[PDB]
Ligand binder design. Structure first.
Ligand SMILES: Nc1nc2c(ncn2[C@@H]2O[C@H](COP(=O)(O)OP(=O)(O)CP(=O)(O)O)[C@@H](O)[C@H]2O)c(=O)[nH]1
Ligand SMILES: [Cl-]
Ligand SMILES: [Cl-]
Ligand SMILES: [Mg+2]
Length: 715
């Protein structure tokens, strides 16, 4: 529907910008593909990457446009199919920035799962409107053999669960967001077998759930697909209940744009005004063989045209648009111009990165950053196979990191090697593949290792740090953050920019003494610095330097130069030299670093390692094989439930223990165990493993091969 798409994209009221989101494997891509087939867009089309087809997983968000007719008018559905695996969660985040509505897909059998909540929360954070498609209802009918009422109960429990999540996330918006099957905001069906129903649709066609069960039970789901077409029921739901750009954009900018809402551009964004100045939110960078580098984004105001110039936020020179169009899976349909309200593919924006604001005016308030979180937990060292390829590798790693901001690329100064840090083993496997196959650089990679965290287990101090000229002294106590306070900081509930009586009240109503709440001076990662001193001359002008020493230590702790978390650092006393020449950065910053590092080692310094939480659905026949695999990897079982022939195992294990788990769990269960994973958190390494783990880390970093001591820091 090439000419259809183009005619429709000019009319913002008939557009739906949507994303398909779900727990891994609940059926996003089958849904998206069969929506496209039913709609006559195609005869898995969206998993068009080779590794996606090879591994049977969505790795990258894919974009496609779809024409659907509803009550005598055609609508343009700009759809994003997103990945389910936690390692690719940043693809979901970037996609939620670009869409206005979301089809939350949930497997009827497993029901809502941990990444179901994750994707729902990411949608609501962006003021994206959710509807619900309960998929795999064929399995629920054919494998559990439940009566209609049992199946009404099961489906209704899923709806209720999604609604509790919504109500917990957006309590004041709950009424308008609540999912109601009788209203039509929920459908149920089988993406695989091209059929779907909803309460209003069943009334309309005169078909009950008992007839639906018969269709499946008598091996006639093809007939059901004709009577109850998947694409009709779901696309209708999309048109009816997901919002157009005209309703939505004013809601999106409440949370993605902190500029003057009554400005010229705030109005033209709020009105989807094609004649306004360009306002284009860049959500993705990727490379194609013909278009070259391509920026994906959401156009809120203006019109994009080949040859038009836009400014990129933070960059001085104006970028020129070379081509504009829409993605159709692996293809990108080119068009003369695209108007506000659409999800666009643009070439020629050399300076754009994920999160960029493209605008006509250089002085436009930039859109809010695309939030990240989830710091890397797995790392690999990477090197060019042939030394003639070193500068290509430099340029290629820059490009890989630009296209995937969840990857962190640093350089080992003690080996000249590049380190790739990402979300998991699979994440790094794909990256190494996308450097060789796609970027044409032969590389060698080390085995994946985890990134640890350093912390303390007890209180210590006051410890005296002394400047190299011996003229300045700082007295530091250190101890663990209480869990309530750690959570406030990790969730961003407090801040030094925040108001001082407000922050003091949040901290104190969390357990912190008034002394320490009012003394809090700095936050850095999941650590705080408190000033407990009164009336020390020159400490005000010197405190900025003390905090720099604190920040440096947080970046890499004294045990193994791993990042530090969970620390409460307190300045109890200080002595500074009268003359500023004796108390500048070269004097104060080392004194601060050394006091803090010595206190840490005196406070039961130890390592935390990342843990994954693992969910396994396995038939009873293979339960024993599943159990042996997780228990053999020193994982702890957390709970176990039975639901018919299936055992549901909830377990945790160190990330470091779960490398190669996919292939081993398949072998031990003959491929019959479904499993998924999520980051749990950093937990203490075994107490009898601290010396060996620290030595292991220091050796592979090039650091000195000896256990650090507080005598290394304070003379
Ligand atoms: N029985 C049944 N199987 C389905 C249905 N929908 C999808 N599947 C199956 O589930 C598996 C995963 O399907 P897929 O569309 O790739 O799910 P996905 O959520 O996109 C996977 P990922 O999270 O990695 O992107 C496939 O074997 C697919 O055939 C359904 O309605 N019924
Ligand atoms: Cl605390
Ligand atoms: Cl002062
Ligand atoms: Mg998929």
């Amino acid at each position: 529907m090439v000419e259809r798409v183009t005619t429709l994209m000019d009319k913002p009221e008939f557009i739906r910008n949507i994303g398909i989101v779900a727990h891994i494997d609940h059926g996003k891509t089958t849904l998206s593909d069969n929506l496209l087939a039913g709609a006559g867009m195609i005869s898995l089309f969206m998993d068009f990457d080779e590794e996606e087809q090879k591994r049977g997983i969505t790795i990258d968000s894919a974009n496609v446009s779809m024409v659907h007719e509803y009550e005598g008018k055609e609508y343009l559905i700009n759809l994003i199919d997103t990945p389910g695996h936690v390692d690719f969660g940043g693809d979901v985040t970037r996609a939620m920035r670009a869409v206005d509505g979301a089809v939350v897909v949930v497997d009827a059998v497993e029901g809502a799962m941990p990444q179901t909540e994750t994707v729902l929360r990411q949608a609501l954070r962006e003021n994206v409107v959710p509807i619900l498609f309960i998929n795999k209802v064929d399995r629920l009918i054919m494998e559990l053999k439940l009566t209609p009422q049992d199946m009404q109960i099961r489906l209704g429990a899923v709806i209720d669960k999604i609604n509790k999540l919504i109500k917990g996330m957006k309590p004041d918006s709950y009424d308008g967001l609540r999912l109601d099957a009788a209203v039509g905001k929920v459908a149920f069906g089988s993406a695989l077998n091209n059929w779907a129903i909803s309460v209003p649709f069943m009334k309309k066609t005169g078909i009950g759930f008992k007839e639906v069960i018969e269709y499946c039970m008598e091996d006639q789901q093809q007939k059901l697909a004709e009577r109850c077409p998947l694409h009709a029921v779901v696309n209708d739901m999309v048109i009816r209940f997901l919002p157009n750009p005209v309703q939505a954009q004013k809601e999106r900018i409440k949370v993605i744009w902190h500029g003057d809402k009554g400005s010229e551009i705030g109005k033209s964004m709020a009105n989807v005004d094609p004649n306004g100045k360009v306002a284009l939110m860049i959500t993705d960078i990727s490379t194609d063989p013909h278009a070259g580098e391509v920026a994906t984004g959401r156009l809120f105001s203006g019109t994009l045209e080949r040859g038009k110039e836009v400014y990129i936020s933070g960059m001085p020179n104006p970028n020129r648009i070379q081509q504009v169009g829409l993605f159709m899976g692996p293809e990108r349909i080119e068009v003369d111009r695209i108007t506000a309200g659409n999800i666009v593919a643009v070439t020629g924006l050399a300076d754009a990165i994920v999160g960029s604001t493209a605008s006509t005016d250089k002085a436009m308030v930039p859109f809010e950053s695309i939030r990240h979180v989830s710091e890397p937990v797995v790392t690999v060292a990477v090197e060019a196979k042939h030394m003639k390829d070193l500068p290509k590798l430099v340029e290629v790693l820059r490009q890989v990191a630009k296209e995937d901001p969840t990857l962190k690329v640093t350089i080992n100064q003690e080996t000249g090697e590049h380190l790739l840090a990402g979300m998991g083993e699979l994440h790094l496997e794909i990256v190494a593949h996308r450097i060789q196959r796609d970027k044409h650089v032969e590389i060698t990679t080390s085995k994946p290792l985890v990134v640890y965290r350093e912390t303390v287990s007890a209180h210590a101090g006051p410890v005296e740090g002394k400047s190299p000229n011996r003229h300045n002294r700082f007295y530091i106590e250190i101890e663990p953050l209480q869990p309530a306070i750690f959570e406030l900081v990790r969730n961003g509930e407090i801040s030094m920019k925040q108001q001082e009586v407000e922050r003091r009240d949040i901290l104190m109503k969390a357990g912190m003494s008034k002394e320490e709440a009012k003394g809090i001076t700095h936050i850095s990662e999941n650590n705080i610095f408190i000033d407990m001193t009164k009336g020390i001359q020159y400490l005000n002008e010197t405190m900025e330097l003390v905090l720099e020493g604190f920040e440096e230590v947080i970046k890499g702790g004294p045990l193994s130069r791993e990042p530090v978390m969970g620390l409460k650092v307190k300045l109890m006393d200080a002595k500074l030299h009268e003359d500023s020449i004796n108390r500048g950065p070269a004097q104060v910053i080392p004194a601060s670093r050394q006091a803090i590092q010595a206190a840490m080692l005196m406070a039961g310094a130890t390592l935390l390692e990342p843990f994954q939480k693992v969910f396994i659905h396995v038939p009873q026949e293979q339960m024993g094989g599943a159990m042996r695999e997780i228990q053999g990897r020193r994982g702890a079982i957390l709970d176990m439930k039975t639901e018919g022939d299936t055992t549901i195992i909830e377990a945790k294990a160190p990330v470091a223990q779960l490398f190669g788990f996919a292939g081993d769990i398949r072998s031990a269960t003959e491929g019959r165990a479904m499993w998924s994973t999520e980051f749990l958190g950093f937990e203490p390494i075994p107490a009898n493993m601290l010396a060996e783990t620290v030595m292991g880390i220091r050796q592979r970093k090039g650091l000195k091969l000896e256990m650090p001591k507080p005598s290394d820091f304070i003379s």
